[PDB]
Write a protein that binds this ligand. Structure first.
Ligand code: HEC
Ligand code: HEC
Ligand code: HEC
Ligand code: HEC
Ligand code: HEC
Ligand code: HEC
Ligand code: HEC
Ligand code: HEC
Ligand code: HEC
Ligand code: HEC
Ligand SMILES: [Ca+2]
Ligand SMILES: [Ca+2]
Ligand SMILES: [Ca+2]
Ligand SMILES: [Ca+2]
Ligand SMILES: [Cl-]
Ligand SMILES: [Cl-]
Ligand SMILES: [Cl-]
Ligand SMILES: [Cl-]
Ligand SMILES: [Zn+2]
Ligand SMILES: [Zn+2]
Lengths: 482, 475
């Protein structure tokens, strides 16, 4: 093709690739829900209101578990790639109420949202990352419709060969001694998704260019590996050694936490399909026959939307769609039910540490050592459930790891409850005895605008721990500065 | 063939079936251990001693968890079918120290160990079940080598067609409206193993012929199903209503327990293979049909798997098995630890002398139930011989629920004492309740031995008595 190697416009590909383009346009369907997933952007913590506000399979405790982090404001089920920027610009996680108009998040937040990344990294280099996210938000900076996730994110425009635009994934391949050119078509059919559907973190300024994205894979891809990995890479001590990494300090328990984000690749690669050489594209980009021929479907969505499960039957030819669906649900039902329980246990763990920190009664002689261990268990337990929760398959990508991970999560949280309780000489035991939902009610609603209202914050024991934000008018709506 | 319809002597088949016979003799290999299984009968709770006594992947807490039940005496890894009787007659679970020479276990214990069952049931009818196990133990009653599990257990001797000898399995098929003659060859290739590789219980006399074996499947095959099933079928109260079934009362916690035994069928049937119509025989009796029924992991090339998984190497298949087993084994040990803590919490609460909570009795009743349920759940996984592989998701989900139940028991019992016992339960459970490495019927005769461990100390000393049975020999 004659399309520019750096083309950011999806529309530039339509004329020469009408079939793949029209298929990619189906990502605009945001009306169908499946049993646990789907394309309606409901609030992931809302199991009270019906669709599309909430959902029967929402996670009630999310806001509590992320108290003090932007995810306490908004976090929704995902839509197709065509809406990435729209959703990016609607999310309350990015500050829209600051006078200077700053989002209070790094420009790195654009990293997995647009092909424009190539041009921005070319222009700004290492310095792009820590610029404010909202410095690239106006209509003259990005076209939400045409420059959202598109063809140039996975294809070399000139040859249409599979190509990585991703700096952090390229960093990883470089670090691990891998080489794109020597990789199989098969491996590439997974790696293009691994540019974005992974857990990541923002570089601390003591260790490299501020906010440069990193995939924390050096210790391995499992939750335990990541937990071990995150014992380093944080801020340096007066003595220069990087301490443990910290995404935020929980506003209730004051525990230094790690946030997990969509670890699809890490979860799937050692699962029953991933370990066998099956690629993301095999299930999510099935060959389909449309208008005279066989194309790679570019509708990247839930395979459960198709009652016949065609995308599975090129390998599971002897199975009916219903059978395959039931085997998916066989795992998801179990994973979802246990996840909710690991989440309650995590909340109780946070509450135990919070109660112990506030405990005025006589303490155990080894109080400080007990609390230090309790905090670490809160952090570890949460990293583990989040690793499963944040992952979009609800256990199907890797059933055994999901369930094993949830079980370890709960064990860690329970250990935090036990240690913190012992630290107070069991003074806080009675309180921790009830329904955790009574002591720490799930936070259904919480937004940047609401956090401006003291009388709102008082309505829940945990929101009560947040500071009131300055009374302020909304300054950004979508791409309009106001 | 001319072979008699209830021929019990395996050797009667050697002549017309040398190939299958020699293949079945391969079950005599009892030397190889795999990563988690194998054919060396090591003591399943012993992770201290060398093979063939212990193993690095043993379950340290078993004796504690079965305190008050024969399984506290001996429980070993399994050997091939050819040794069923030998192992049956060596086990300390059956009493060998009684003057009258009784084993103190029902003859039903023979049910899944010999074809002679057909003749015995024909001779005694339902009176057979409750007779003492040792009434059929002498050489003149059974040939340990020729009449152990054999050809007649799965084959109609005359035609060699697949056939069920099992009363309990036939009972089930009859109850559930199923019919052998209308069943697929495929389904039969699983059912012959389901005659024995399942969870079962002994009928309480109030509800049917004493000790008749039943497969508790009416509520479904899952652990929750069985737990619900066992809310009934126990002893009747004055109004004739059967109470909850109980296998034994835990000697420490005094909780009425349910024992799970080798639920291979129940576990595997809704797993990734079982749900897909794959049979036990497909993996364990690879194509003649190999009659070596053992661990498929003994074969580095995993031949038995590659007629379906042709594009995979043996190493790959092995790693995928281990991917599940290692996770299942690690979590099991933890569920077991939590179960011990739950028993100990209920025990400490029962003994508690301090201020009780006003709703003590209701809290304890729920705590006990949770001990019982938690244990049924881990045992369902532990007792099963695949260490998670037959059904990875159910195994792990089941272990997680088990732990949840046990933790609930700890919480309820603790709350019942107004938290007076909380400090006592805070440490390493292995310190407060040390694993019982060694315990036998002979040792339980010695008070000084019993004092060596806080839980064996809760057992009564058995009468000083000489051993009366060894193998099939009286003494
Ligand atoms: C790749 C390494 C990414 C980084 C860096 C950021 N995001 Fe992301 N984002 C990514 C994926 C693969 C997905 C879909 C999967 C999922 O579970 O969300 C998303 C999704 C979003 C969304 C929509 C869903 C929601 O969270 O409500 C938003 C609003 C979003 N992302 C914003 C966002 C922000 C603020 C980031 C910086 C902190 C950020 N993304 C980084 C991939 C990646
Ligand atoms: C990653 C998220 C992709 C996006 C964005 C786009 N494409 Fe794609 N494409 C992707 C994969 C993994 C594959 C399979 C390649 C293989 O060798 O198996 C493809 C394939 C194509 C092809 C080749 C013909 C076919 O198999 O259909 C074409 C012509 C193509 N894709 C076009 C295309 C267009 C026009 C896109 C923007 C609208 C586009 N792709 C985005 C991965 C991804
Ligand atoms: C960054 C450049 C990405 C690449 C490369 C891939 N994905 Fe993605 N995906 C990304 C984001 C930010 C989002 C959220 C968009 C939003 O507006 O919420 C998604 C979403 C998905 C979904 C859900 C779509 C739905 O209908 O619900 C799926 C199923 C999905 N992504 C899959 C997927 C696959 C298979 C990819 C490789 C071929 C892939 N994505 C690449 C970000 C990016
Ligand atoms: C087949 C065995 C699959 C492979 C290989 C991959 N995915 Fe998957 N994915 C699959 C199923 C059956 C589901 C559940 C769908 C449902 O409705 O429950 C998923 C889920 C996802 C999602 C979430 C979809 C949504 O509605 O937002 C995403 C984002 C996703 N998968 C991405 C993804 C990636 C990155 C993969 C390679 C690393 C991958 N999938 C492989 C089936 C299969
Ligand atoms: C080939 C590229 C495949 C596609 C497309 C799908 N599956 Fe698959 N599946 C495949 C392999 C190689 C395996 C492991 C067995 C092996 O030979 O190594 C599987 C396994 C499963 C299972 C069993 C595991 C479980 O979770 O119970 C299920 C239920 C399953 N696959 C379902 C499934 C679905 C829903 C798919 C479409 C979305 C699908 N498979 C596609 C190979 C391939
Ligand atoms: C079928 C319904 C059976 C009943 C009734 C009894 N046993 Fe069993 N036994 C059965 C199987 C499928 C196996 C091998 C699988 C396993 O996990 O053990 C066994 C094994 C034994 C063994 C050897 C292993 C051991 O426990 O050390 C012994 C000593 C044994 N069985 C004895 C025994 C007793 C005493 C029974 C009555 C209480 C009994 N069996 C019943 C199948 C079945
Ligand atoms: C169950 C535990 C069995 C024992 C004990 C014996 N056999 Fe078997 N046999 C069994 C199965 C599940 C099958 C497969 C049947 C099918 O239709 O697929 C067989 C098969 C045979 C055959 C048929 C030829 C073959 O496929 O090998 C023969 C001749 C045979 N078995 C003989 C045989 C002998 C001699 C046994 C005692 C030593 C014996 N079987 C025991 C199940 C079981
Ligand atoms: C009762 C009549 C049984 C039938 C029918 C089946 N099995 Fe069995 N099996 C049974 C017992 C009592 C034992 C333990 C024997 C001992 O001395 O410990 C076993 C053992 C096994 C083993 C383990 C053998 C090893 O090498 O470790 C396996 C793998 C096994 N059994 C499988 C199996 C299969 C596949 C069956 C159906 C075809 C089957 N058994 C039937 C009791 C009985
Ligand atoms: C293939 C997918 C299998 C099916 C179908 C059945 N079994 Fe299985 N079994 C399989 C594996 C890979 C293992 C683990 C072996 C190891 O060494 O870890 C097992 C294990 C068993 C055992 C224990 C073996 C031992 O050493 O004692 C038994 C007794 C057993 N399996 C019995 C059994 C039954 C009754 C089945 C049908 C219901 C069955 N297996 C199916 C592989 C597969
Ligand atoms: C046909 C009769 C099979 C034999 C023999 C074995 N497997 Fe299998 N396997 C089979 C099916 C139908 C499936 C589910 C996929 C589907 O099409 O529905 C599987 C799945 C697996 C998996 C993935 C699940 C997991 O536990 O990770 C594995 C790892 C697997 N099978 C391994 C395996 C082994 C070790 C076998 C020999 C002992 C074996 N399979 C035999 C079909 C059949
Ligand atoms: Ca979605
Ligand atoms: Ca992260
Ligand atoms: Ca064995
Ligand atoms: Ca039982
Ligand atoms: Cl954020
Ligand atoms: Cl090991
Ligand atoms: Cl017993
Ligand atoms: Cl008190
Ligand atoms: Zn080991
Ligand atoms: Zn009191």
């Amino acid at each position: 093709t004659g399309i520019a190697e750096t083309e950011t416009k999806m529309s530039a590909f339509k004329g020469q690739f009408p079939q793949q383009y029209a298929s990619y346009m189906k990502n605009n369907e945001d009306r169908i829900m499946t049993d646990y997933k789907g394309s309606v952007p409901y609030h992931k913590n809302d199991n009270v209101n019906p669709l599309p506000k909430g959902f029967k399979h929402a996670q009630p405790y999310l806001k509590n578990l992320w108290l003090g982090y932007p995810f306490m404001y908004e976090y929704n089920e995902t839509r197709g790639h065509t809406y990435a920027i729209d959703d990016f610009l609607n999310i309350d996680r990015i500050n829209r109420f600051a006078a200077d108009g700053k989002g209070n998040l790094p420009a790195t937040c654009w990293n997995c949202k647009t092909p424009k990344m190539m041009e921005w990294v070319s222009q700004y280099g290492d310095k792009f990352w820590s610029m404010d996210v909202n410095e690239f938000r106006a209509k003259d900076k990005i076209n939400a419709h045409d420059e959202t996730i598109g063809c140039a994110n996975c294809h070399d425009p000139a040859t249409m060969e599979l190509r990585l635009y991703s700096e952090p994934l390229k960093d990883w391949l470089k670090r691990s001694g891998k080489d794109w050119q020597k990789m199989s078509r098969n491996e590439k059919r997974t790696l293009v998704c691994a540019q974005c559907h992974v857990e990541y973190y923002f570089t601390h300024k003591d260790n490299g260019p501020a906010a440069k994205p990193v995939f924390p894979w050096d210790n391995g891809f499992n939750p335990e590996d990541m937990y071990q990995y995150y014992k380093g890479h944080g801020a340096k001590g007066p003595d220069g050694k990087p301490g443990p990494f910290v995404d935020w300090v929980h506003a209730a328990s004051k525990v230094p936490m790690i946030k997990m984000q969509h670890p699809e690749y890490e979860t799937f690669q050692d699962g029953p399909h991933g370990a066998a050489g099956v690629s993301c594209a095999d299930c999510h980009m099935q060959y389909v026959r449309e208008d005279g021929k066989k194309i790679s479907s570019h509708w990247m969505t839930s395979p459960m939307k198709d009652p016949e499960m065609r995308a599975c039957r090129q390998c599971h030819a002897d199975k009916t769609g219903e059978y395959l669906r039931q085997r998916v649900l066989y795992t998801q039902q179990k994973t979802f039910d246990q996840l909710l329980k690991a989440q309650e246990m995590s909340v109780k763990a946070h509450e135990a540490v919070r109660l112990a920190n506030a405990y005025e009664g006589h303490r155990a002689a080894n109080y400080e050592a007990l609390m230090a261990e309790a905090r670490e268990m809160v952090r570890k337990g949460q990293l583990f459930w989040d690793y499963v929760s944040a992952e979009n398959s609800v256990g199907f990508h890797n059933p055994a790891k999901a369930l094993d991970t949830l079980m370890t999560s709960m064990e860690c949280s329970q250990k935090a409850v036990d240690l913190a309780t012992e630290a107070t000489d069991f003074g806080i035991a009675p309180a921790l005895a009830g329904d955790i939902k009574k002591l720490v009610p799930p936070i259904l609603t919480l937004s940047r605008k609401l956090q401006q209202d003291p009388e709102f914050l008082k309505q829940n024991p945990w929101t009560r721990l947040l500071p009131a934000l300055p009374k302020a008018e909304q300054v950004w709506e979508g791409q309009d500065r106001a």
